[PDB]
Amino acid sequence: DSVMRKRKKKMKKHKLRKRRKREKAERRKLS
Amino acid sequence: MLYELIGLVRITNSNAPKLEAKELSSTIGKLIIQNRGVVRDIVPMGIRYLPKIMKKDQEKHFRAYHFLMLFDSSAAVQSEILRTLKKDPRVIRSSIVKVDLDKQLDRASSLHRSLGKKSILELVNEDYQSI
Amino acid sequence: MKIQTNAVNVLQRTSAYLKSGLLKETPAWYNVVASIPPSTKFTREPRFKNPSNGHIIGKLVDVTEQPHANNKGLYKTRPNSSDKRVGVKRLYRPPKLTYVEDRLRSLFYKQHPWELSRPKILVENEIGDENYDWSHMLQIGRPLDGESVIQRTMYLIKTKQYGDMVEAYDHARYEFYALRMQEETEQQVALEEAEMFGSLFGVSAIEHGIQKEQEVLDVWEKKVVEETELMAARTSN
Amino acid sequence: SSEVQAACMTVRIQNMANHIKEHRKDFANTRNLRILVQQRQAILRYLKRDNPEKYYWTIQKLGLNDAAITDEFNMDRRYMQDYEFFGD
Amino acid sequence: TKKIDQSLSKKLPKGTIYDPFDFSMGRIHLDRKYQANKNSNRNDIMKSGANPLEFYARPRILSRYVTSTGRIQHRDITGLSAKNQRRLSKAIRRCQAIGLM
Amino acid sequence: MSQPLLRNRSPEESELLKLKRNYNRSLLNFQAHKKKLNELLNLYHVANEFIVTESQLLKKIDKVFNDETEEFTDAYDVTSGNTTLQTQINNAIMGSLSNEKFFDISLVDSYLNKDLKNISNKIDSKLN
Amino acid sequence: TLAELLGRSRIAQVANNHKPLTYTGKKFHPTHQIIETKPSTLYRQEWGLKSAIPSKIKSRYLVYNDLDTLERITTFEPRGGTQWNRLRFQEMGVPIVSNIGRQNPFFKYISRPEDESHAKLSLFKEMKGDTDISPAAMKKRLKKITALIRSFQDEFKEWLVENHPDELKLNSNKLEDYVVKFLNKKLETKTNKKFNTEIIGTGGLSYSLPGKLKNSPNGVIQRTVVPGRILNVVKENNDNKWLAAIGGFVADVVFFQSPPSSFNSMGDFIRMKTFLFEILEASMEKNGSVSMHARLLEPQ
RNA sequence: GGAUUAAAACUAGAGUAGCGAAACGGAUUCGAUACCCGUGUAGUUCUAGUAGUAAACUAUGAAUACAAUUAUUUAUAUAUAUAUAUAUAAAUAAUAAAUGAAAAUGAAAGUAUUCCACCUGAAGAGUACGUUAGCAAUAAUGAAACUCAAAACAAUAGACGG
Ligand SMILES: [K+]
Ligand SMILES: [K+]
Ligand SMILES: [Mg+2]
Ligand SMILES: [Mg+2]
Ligand SMILES: [Mg+2]
Ligand SMILES: [Mg+2]
Ligand SMILES: [Mg+2]
Ligand SMILES: [Mg+2]
Ligand SMILES: [Mg+2]
Ligand SMILES: [Mg+2]
Ligand SMILES: [Mg+2]
Ligand SMILES: [Mg+2]
Ligand SMILES: [Mg+2]
Ligand SMILES: [Mg+2]
Ligand SMILES: [Mg+2]
Ligand SMILES: [Mg+2]
């Protein structure tokens, strides 16, 4: 796939990583 | 295995330039012959100026007596000789390179092989048949 | 490039035009081409002999044909790797033509470098007219040169007068020296005899060279002076 | 002959195994050892099919058993721990 | 001036044959263009058949293939075969480590 | 088409084939064995220069590190093969009857084969 | 057949040559065969080669290496100037003489073994004449020969004990002599370098026999006078003789006593003037060069 | 199934010059959580482990048989009038044929054969859930619903380019 199409997967991976960092943080405070 | 040692001995006394080299060759030669080894040749190379000022055991040097020693010994003995040379304050630099004997049993020193004399027999036969 | 089909089938494509009626009149070439068909196979052809030396191409020597030991002292009992590789390519590769005379020709001009300085004409007259009897070196129609020696050497080895090629070659070389010496004298004497009867010549070969060298040495003088003055200015910087 | 090949491989396997025991991080030569051991298995498996009597004689003399030859072997980490290849 | 730079005059050797063109400037330029160190082979030990690795204890010979600072010359300059260049470079590196070069 | 595709070797052909193949293997083993002995002979000729005792070591050190002795200083391309090539040529032609100090295995072979002795007597008998 | 005809064709007659057409080293003799075309053929660019020579070429003489190449051109140089050097030598009428007084190579003389007393000098020249031989092909002259010579051991182990047994029991000083002769005697039948590529005599520069006098209307010519040019204004360094350019050859000029004053005056342009020279002798060296000695005849 | 597996990361014990996430400062800027500069913690290093992921790419699985040329190296062998010449392989470059959507591939991306892996519109999604493994970060396995008539590749002519 071209760079243009790769960029869509890049955004999805970024948002998943951002959400998992956010979830981690919560667990630390709630723990 | 056949090994070729090249040692740069220190010239402390300008009056006796070839004194530590003789004492060192005897020490190394005795180790070889006392551990089932054979000393094939000892080619002195003379006093030469070092490419730079070198240091050893908190001392500096600008010249050294170069000498070559072709000897046959086991790998364990060869490492023992190298360990003693790396510790002796007299020795400034020492290298031991293996000389392959796979194809022929009698190989001359690299210095001689560089001059076309591949075996010690060629060197000896040029000192008897023509000298 | 692909093997073309339309150049050799003009007769068949034309015949379809005439049969249908698209072309009313038969072309003038039509009958001529029909009676003389073009060759249309365009195939690669194997070859089983070198025409120059008669060496056979495509023959494998079997182990049964090598019963005796080799130069190493070993017998051959099984085919080697080379014998087991297909050699079809050798059948199709144009054979390298070789000649024994080529070896002698190189030798002659290595021994006599100045024979190269004698101009040779490569333009042929008529190869089919050459009626030469190589019992003697001189021949009417061709110059005396290195080729005269080589052909004489071959005739000697062909007639079996000499066995070794070297001996035949040496014999021919001396015949060549004798003919070369008689010609060097005929030219020297002819010049001497003419001058003694009042012949005059404008420019000799030595004079021709001096004049040509002067023309070159004059241009060289100008440039040297010019370039020995630009240097002086450029170096002054 | 398969018996000779297996014996010649055995000598090299023994030497190579000794090397690995002193060079446990030399993975390049561990891979070579694995392949060589598997090659010996293949040659002996053919021998069992070709000449069963010689096969059993050969493996007995080499110190192996039928299981060592027939069973799939990968010389993996579990093998190095179950037979204490490196010792301790 | 009765003097010419050597670069502007050709000295014909003794025993050689010459043509009128040999006195021209074209000959001077042609000799410069086609001036290559082809006589090195006969004076180049490493292009004779010796193994360059046998000279690791002879810095004088090895110093002929390094620049003024000791940088090994590229094969494009030495003109050696791939094997001899490979062996020569090893010899020089070994010589440097021994303390001779 | 009627010709058989393969003709099996006759028992006699297989016998001659085995003779040649056994000979080939035996000749190579013999030639390698003789080459090794010839190298052992050329090593014996030079073993007088090798040191295995302290007495030899002291003599070698003195003879090499002496002011008279010359040392390989590698400062100039010294000037001067044939010598060693002449010993080879003579040992190839003469063989057992050679005058070279460094001889080949021919001499040792003639000794153990009763040739250097059966020729010495032959020459002496001729002189008689 | 076509193959037979091709071998005898005029193109086949020219020996293969790949020597550089542009050579800047020392030239002692011709290296390429001069090709000549007639004026009629030149008008049609026909030279008897594979392809037409470009019309720009106006000379009728050329030298070539390859009939055709991957660049779709002929490799040739439009020059034929070594022929004029040979003809100018002929005009100087100086026969080439041997400075060593050797037999004339162009005569079939009955020679004897006077020089064959150096059998060990030249029998070993085959293996010792290897100045420019490969390091391993020259080494193949050691095992290949050793086996050949070692195959004559039985023959020499019987001949020597049957013709010179005393030497075998007394000294090898004479045995070595019998060995050198044996191999040569068993090698003359063989063919080792049976063809010798060395230049034979003059190499074809001159086929003139010494002895003849040049008759002229003004009497017999006793001294040959030839115009020439002085190249250097200072004698060859380390040599007591200057250099002259006479008839396409560089000679060594010896002056009577003093050097004419035009030398200092002209300086580095001395080559711009023509002097008269006398050709004393002409010799031939083994490299194939001609050693021409001259004398600067000065108006007196 | 097994083994090995860049960088980052992690668990212990050392090391820590230089570099350098982060952090704290200096600038730039309309603003500058950046680009540039400073101080510089983890890390980068070694020893013993965990983990098995990369545009881990030639974006091209492995094996076998076969097909037209040239050039250039390399290797082996052969010959000699001793340094070339002649052979047979390998590699690389440019190609014929063939193939292909074409770009191109070129001894395969050709002509065939054998075996394995994998794919079936886009997005949702390599996500959710479950399970397995790991100290952990995570890795592997891996959907469906809803929505849409899209989505993608090569090439062509333009327009534009700090
Ligand atoms: K650090
Ligand atoms: K696969
Ligand atoms: Mg894809
Ligand atoms: Mg297998
Ligand atoms: Mg890396
Ligand atoms: Mg840590
Ligand atoms: Mg900040
Ligand atoms: Mg700010
Ligand atoms: Mg920073
Ligand atoms: Mg692991
Ligand atoms: Mg991941
Ligand atoms: Mg992946
Ligand atoms: Mg990579
Ligand atoms: Mg495989
Ligand atoms: Mg996952
Ligand atoms: Mg596109």
CSV table of N, CA and C in Angstrom, one decimal, chain G residues 195-294:
chain,number,residue,atom,x,y,z
G,195,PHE,N,60.7,-22.7,-32.3
G,195,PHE,CA,60.6,-21.5,-33.0
G,195,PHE,C,61.1,-20.3,-32.1
G,196,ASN,N,62.1,-19.6,-32.6
G,196,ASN,CA,62.7,-18.5,-31.8
G,196,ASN,C,62.1,-17.2,-32.4
G,197,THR,N,61.5,-16.4,-31.5
G,197,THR,CA,60.9,-15.1,-31.9
G,197,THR,C,61.8,-14.0,-31.9
G,198,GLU,N,63.1,-14.1,-31.6
G,198,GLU,CA,64.0,-13.0,-31.6
G,198,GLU,C,64.2,-12.5,-33.0
G,199,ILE,N,64.5,-11.2,-33.0
G,199,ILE,CA,64.7,-10.5,-34.3
G,199,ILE,C,66.0,-11.1,-34.9
G,200,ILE,N,65.9,-11.4,-36.2
G,200,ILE,CA,67.0,-12.0,-37.0
G,200,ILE,C,67.7,-10.9,-37.7
G,201,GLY,N,68.9,-10.6,-37.2
G,201,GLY,CA,69.8,-9.6,-37.9
G,201,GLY,C,69.1,-8.2,-37.9
G,202,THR,N,69.1,-7.6,-39.0
G,202,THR,CA,68.5,-6.3,-39.1
G,202,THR,C,67.0,-6.2,-39.0
G,203,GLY,N,66.3,-7.4,-39.0
G,203,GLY,CA,64.9,-7.4,-38.9
G,203,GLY,C,64.2,-7.0,-40.2
G,204,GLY,N,64.9,-6.8,-41.3
G,204,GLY,CA,64.4,-6.4,-42.6
G,204,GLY,C,64.6,-4.9,-42.9
G,205,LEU,N,65.3,-4.2,-42.0
G,205,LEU,CA,65.6,-2.8,-42.3
G,205,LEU,C,66.5,-2.6,-43.5
G,206,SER,N,67.5,-3.5,-43.6
G,206,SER,CA,68.4,-3.4,-44.8
G,206,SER,C,68.9,-4.8,-45.1
G,207,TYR,N,68.9,-5.1,-46.4
G,207,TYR,CA,69.5,-6.3,-47.0
G,207,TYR,C,70.7,-6.0,-47.8
G,208,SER,N,71.4,-4.9,-47.5
G,208,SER,CA,72.6,-4.5,-48.2
G,208,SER,C,73.8,-5.2,-47.6
G,209,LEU,N,74.7,-5.7,-48.5
G,209,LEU,CA,75.9,-6.4,-48.1
G,209,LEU,C,77.1,-5.4,-48.0
G,210,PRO,N,77.8,-5.3,-46.9
G,210,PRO,CA,79.0,-4.4,-46.9
G,210,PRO,C,80.0,-4.7,-47.9
G,211,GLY,N,80.7,-3.7,-48.4
G,211,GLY,CA,81.8,-3.9,-49.3
G,211,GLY,C,81.7,-3.0,-50.6
G,212,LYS,N,80.5,-2.7,-51.1
G,212,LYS,CA,80.4,-2.1,-52.3
G,212,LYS,C,80.7,-0.6,-52.2
G,213,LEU,N,81.3,0.0,-53.2
G,213,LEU,CA,81.6,1.4,-53.3
G,213,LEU,C,80.6,2.1,-54.2
G,214,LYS,N,80.3,3.4,-53.9
G,214,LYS,CA,79.3,4.2,-54.6
G,214,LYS,C,80.0,5.0,-55.6
G,215,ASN,N,79.9,4.6,-56.9
G,215,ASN,CA,80.4,5.4,-58.0
G,215,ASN,C,79.5,6.7,-58.2
G,216,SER,N,80.2,7.8,-58.5
G,216,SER,CA,79.5,9.0,-58.8
G,216,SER,C,80.2,9.8,-59.9
G,217,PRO,N,79.5,10.7,-60.6
G,217,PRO,CA,80.2,11.5,-61.6
G,217,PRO,C,81.4,12.2,-61.1
G,218,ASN,N,81.5,12.6,-59.9
G,218,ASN,CA,82.6,13.2,-59.3
G,218,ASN,C,83.6,12.3,-58.6
G,219,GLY,N,83.6,11.0,-59.0
G,219,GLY,CA,84.4,10.0,-58.4
G,219,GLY,C,83.7,9.2,-57.4
G,220,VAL,N,84.5,8.2,-56.9
G,220,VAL,CA,83.9,7.3,-55.9
G,220,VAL,C,83.7,8.1,-54.6
G,221,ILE,N,82.5,7.9,-54.0
G,221,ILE,CA,82.2,8.5,-52.7
G,221,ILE,C,82.9,7.9,-51.6
G,222,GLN,N,83.6,8.6,-50.8
G,222,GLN,CA,84.4,8.1,-49.7
G,222,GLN,C,83.7,8.4,-48.3
G,223,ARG,N,82.9,9.4,-48.3
G,223,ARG,CA,82.2,9.8,-47.0
G,223,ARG,C,80.8,10.2,-47.4
G,224,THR,N,79.8,9.6,-46.7
G,224,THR,CA,78.4,9.9,-46.9
G,224,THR,C,78.0,11.1,-46.1
G,225,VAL,N,77.5,12.1,-46.8
G,225,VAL,CA,77.0,13.4,-46.2
G,225,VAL,C,75.5,13.4,-46.3
G,226,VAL,N,74.9,13.6,-45.1
G,226,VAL,CA,73.4,13.5,-45.0
G,226,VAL,C,72.9,14.7,-44.2
G,227,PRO,N,72.0,15.5,-44.6
G,227,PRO,CA,71.4,16.6,-43.8
G,227,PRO,C,70.8,16.1,-42.5
G,228,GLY,N,70.9,16.8,-41.5
G,228,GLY,CA,70.3,16.4,-40.2
G,228,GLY,C,69.9,17.6,-39.3
G,229,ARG,N,69.6,17.3,-38.1
G,229,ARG,CA,69.2,18.3,-37.1
G,229,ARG,C,69.7,17.9,-35.7
G,230,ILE,N,70.3,18.9,-35.0
G,230,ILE,CA,70.7,18.7,-33.6
G,230,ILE,C,69.5,19.0,-32.7
G,231,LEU,N,69.2,18.0,-31.8
G,231,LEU,CA,68.1,18.1,-31.0
G,231,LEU,C,68.3,18.9,-29.7
G,232,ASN,N,69.4,18.6,-29.0
G,232,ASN,CA,69.8,19.3,-27.8
G,232,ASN,C,70.9,20.2,-28.0
G,233,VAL,N,70.9,21.3,-27.2
G,233,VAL,CA,72.0,22.3,-27.2
G,233,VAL,C,73.1,21.9,-26.1
G,234,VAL,N,72.9,20.8,-25.4
G,234,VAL,CA,73.9,20.4,-24.4
G,234,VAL,C,74.0,18.9,-24.5
G,235,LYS,N,75.2,18.4,-24.6
G,235,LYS,CA,75.5,17.0,-24.8
G,235,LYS,C,74.6,16.1,-23.9
G,236,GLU,N,74.2,14.9,-24.3
G,236,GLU,CA,73.4,14.0,-23.5
G,236,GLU,C,74.1,13.9,-22.1
G,237,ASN,N,73.3,14.1,-21.1
G,237,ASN,CA,73.9,14.0,-19.7
G,237,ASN,C,74.5,12.7,-19.5
G,238,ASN,N,75.7,12.7,-19.0
G,238,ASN,CA,76.5,11.5,-18.7
G,238,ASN,C,77.2,10.9,-19.9
G,239,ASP,N,76.9,11.4,-21.1
G,239,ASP,CA,77.5,10.9,-22.4
G,239,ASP,C,78.2,12.1,-23.1
G,240,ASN,N,79.3,11.7,-23.7
G,240,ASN,CA,80.2,12.7,-24.4
G,240,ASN,C,79.7,13.0,-25.8
G,241,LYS,N,78.5,12.6,-26.2
G,241,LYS,CA,78.0,12.8,-27.5
G,241,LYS,C,76.6,13.5,-27.5
G,242,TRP,N,76.4,14.4,-28.5
G,242,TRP,CA,75.1,15.0,-28.6
G,242,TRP,C,74.1,14.0,-29.4
G,243,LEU,N,72.9,14.5,-29.6
G,243,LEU,CA,71.9,13.7,-30.4
G,243,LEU,C,71.5,14.5,-31.6
G,244,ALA,N,71.4,13.8,-32.7
G,244,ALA,CA,71.0,14.3,-34.0
G,244,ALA,C,69.8,13.5,-34.5
G,245,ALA,N,69.0,14.2,-35.4
G,245,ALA,CA,67.8,13.6,-36.0
G,245,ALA,C,68.1,13.5,-37.5
G,246,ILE,N,68.6,12.3,-38.0
G,246,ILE,CA,69.0,12.1,-39.4
G,246,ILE,C,68.1,11.1,-40.0
G,247,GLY,N,67.3,11.5,-41.0
G,247,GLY,CA,66.5,10.5,-41.8
G,247,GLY,C,65.6,9.6,-41.0
G,248,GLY,N,64.9,10.2,-40.0
G,248,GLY,CA,63.9,9.4,-39.2
G,248,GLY,C,64.6,8.6,-38.2
G,249,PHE,N,65.9,8.8,-37.9
G,249,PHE,CA,66.6,8.0,-36.9
G,249,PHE,C,67.3,9.0,-36.0
G,250,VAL,N,67.4,8.7,-34.7
G,250,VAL,CA,68.2,9.5,-33.7
G,250,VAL,C,69.6,8.9,-33.6
G,251,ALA,N,70.6,9.7,-33.9
G,251,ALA,CA,72.0,9.2,-33.9
G,251,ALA,C,72.8,9.9,-32.9
G,252,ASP,N,73.9,9.4,-32.6
G,252,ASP,CA,74.9,10.0,-31.7
G,252,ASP,C,76.0,10.7,-32.5
G,253,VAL,N,76.0,12.0,-32.4
G,253,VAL,CA,76.9,12.8,-33.2
G,253,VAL,C,78.2,13.1,-32.5
G,254,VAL,N,79.3,12.8,-33.0
G,254,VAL,CA,80.6,13.1,-32.5
G,254,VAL,C,81.2,14.3,-33.3
G,255,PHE,N,81.7,15.3,-32.6
G,255,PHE,CA,82.2,16.5,-33.2
G,255,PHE,C,83.7,16.4,-33.4
G,256,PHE,N,84.3,17.1,-34.4
G,256,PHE,CA,85.7,17.0,-34.6
G,256,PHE,C,86.5,17.3,-33.3
G,257,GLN,N,86.5,18.6,-33.0
G,257,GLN,CA,87.1,19.0,-31.7
G,257,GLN,C,86.1,19.8,-30.9
G,258,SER,N,85.6,20.9,-31.5
G,258,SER,CA,84.8,21.9,-30.8
G,258,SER,C,83.3,21.8,-31.3
G,259,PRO,N,82.4,22.4,-30.5
G,259,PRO,CA,81.0,22.5,-31.0
G,259,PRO,C,80.8,23.8,-31.6
G,260,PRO,N,80.2,23.8,-32.9
G,260,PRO,CA,80.0,25.1,-33.6
G,260,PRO,C,79.3,26.1,-32.7
G,261,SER,N,79.6,27.4,-32.9
G,261,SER,CA,79.1,28.5,-32.1
G,261,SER,C,77.6,28.7,-32.3
G,262,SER,N,77.0,28.2,-33.3
G,262,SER,CA,75.5,28.3,-33.5
G,262,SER,C,74.8,27.6,-32.4
G,263,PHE,N,75.4,26.7,-31.7
G,263,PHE,CA,74.7,26.0,-30.6
G,263,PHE,C,74.4,27.0,-29.5
G,264,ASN,N,75.4,27.6,-28.9
G,264,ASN,CA,75.1,28.6,-27.8
G,264,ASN,C,74.1,29.7,-28.3
G,265,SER,N,74.4,30.2,-29.6
G,265,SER,CA,73.5,31.2,-30.1
G,265,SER,C,72.1,30.8,-30.2
G,266,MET,N,71.8,29.7,-30.8
G,266,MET,CA,70.4,29.2,-31.0
G,266,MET,C,69.8,28.8,-29.7
G,267,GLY,N,70.5,28.0,-28.9
G,267,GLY,CA,70.0,27.6,-27.6
G,267,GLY,C,69.1,26.4,-27.8
G,268,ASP,N,67.9,26.5,-27.2
G,268,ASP,CA,66.9,25.5,-27.3
G,268,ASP,C,66.2,25.4,-28.6
G,269,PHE,N,66.4,26.3,-29.5
G,269,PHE,CA,65.9,26.3,-30.9
G,269,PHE,C,66.8,25.7,-31.9
G,270,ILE,N,67.9,25.1,-31.4
G,270,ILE,CA,68.9,24.5,-32.3
G,270,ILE,C,68.3,23.6,-33.3
G,271,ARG,N,67.2,22.9,-32.9
G,271,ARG,CA,66.6,21.9,-33.8
G,271,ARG,C,66.0,22.6,-35.0
G,272,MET,N,65.8,23.9,-35.0
G,272,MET,CA,65.2,24.7,-36.1
G,272,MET,C,66.2,24.8,-37.3
G,273,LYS,N,67.4,24.4,-37.2
G,273,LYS,CA,68.4,24.5,-38.2
G,273,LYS,C,68.9,23.2,-38.7
G,274,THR,N,69.3,23.1,-39.9
G,274,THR,CA,69.8,21.8,-40.5
G,274,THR,C,71.3,21.9,-40.7
G,275,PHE,N,72.0,20.9,-40.2
G,275,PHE,CA,73.4,20.7,-40.4
G,275,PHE,C,73.7,19.5,-41.3
G,276,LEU,N,74.9,19.4,-41.8
G,276,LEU,CA,75.4,18.3,-42.6
G,276,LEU,C,76.2,17.4,-41.7
G,277,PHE,N,75.9,16.1,-41.8
G,277,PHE,CA,76.5,15.0,-41.0
G,277,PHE,C,77.1,14.0,-41.8
G,278,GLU,N,78.1,13.2,-41.2
G,278,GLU,CA,78.7,12.1,-41.9
G,278,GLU,C,78.3,10.9,-41.0
G,279,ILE,N,77.8,9.8,-41.7
G,279,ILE,CA,77.4,8.6,-40.9
G,279,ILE,C,78.6,7.7,-40.9
G,280,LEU,N,79.2,7.6,-39.7
G,280,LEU,CA,80.3,6.7,-39.5
G,280,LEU,C,80.0,5.3,-39.7
G,281,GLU,N,79.2,4.7,-38.8
G,281,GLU,CA,78.8,3.3,-38.8
G,281,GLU,C,77.3,3.2,-38.3
G,282,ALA,N,76.7,2.1,-38.6
G,282,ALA,CA,75.4,1.7,-38.1
G,282,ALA,C,75.4,0.3,-37.6
G,283,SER,N,74.9,0.2,-36.4
G,283,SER,CA,74.9,-1.1,-35.7
G,283,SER,C,73.4,-1.5,-35.3
G,284,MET,N,73.2,-2.7,-35.0
G,284,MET,CA,71.9,-3.2,-34.6
G,284,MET,C,72.0,-3.9,-33.2
G,285,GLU,N,71.2,-3.4,-32.3
G,285,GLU,CA,71.1,-3.9,-30.9
G,285,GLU,C,70.0,-5.0,-30.8
G,286,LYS,N,70.1,-5.7,-29.7
G,286,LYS,CA,69.2,-6.8,-29.5
G,286,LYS,C,67.7,-6.4,-29.3
G,287,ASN,N,67.5,-5.2,-28.8
G,287,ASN,CA,66.2,-4.6,-28.6
G,287,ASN,C,65.5,-4.4,-30.0
G,288,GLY,N,66.3,-4.4,-31.1
G,288,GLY,CA,65.8,-4.1,-32.4
G,288,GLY,C,66.0,-2.7,-32.8
G,289,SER,N,66.8,-1.9,-32.1
G,289,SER,CA,67.1,-0.6,-32.4
G,289,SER,C,68.3,-0.5,-33.3
G,290,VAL,N,68.5,0.6,-34.0
G,290,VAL,CA,69.6,0.9,-34.8
G,290,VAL,C,70.5,1.9,-34.2
G,291,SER,N,71.8,1.6,-34.0
G,291,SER,CA,72.8,2.5,-33.3
G,291,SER,C,73.5,3.2,-34.4
G,292,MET,N,73.1,4.4,-34.8
G,292,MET,CA,73.7,5.2,-35.9
G,292,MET,C,74.6,6.2,-35.3
G,293,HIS,N,75.9,6.2,-35.7
G,293,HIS,CA,76.9,7.1,-35.3
G,293,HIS,C,77.2,8.1,-36.4
G,294,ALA,N,77.2,9.4,-36.1
G,294,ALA,CA,77.4,10.4,-37.1
G,294,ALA,C,78.5,11.4,-36.7
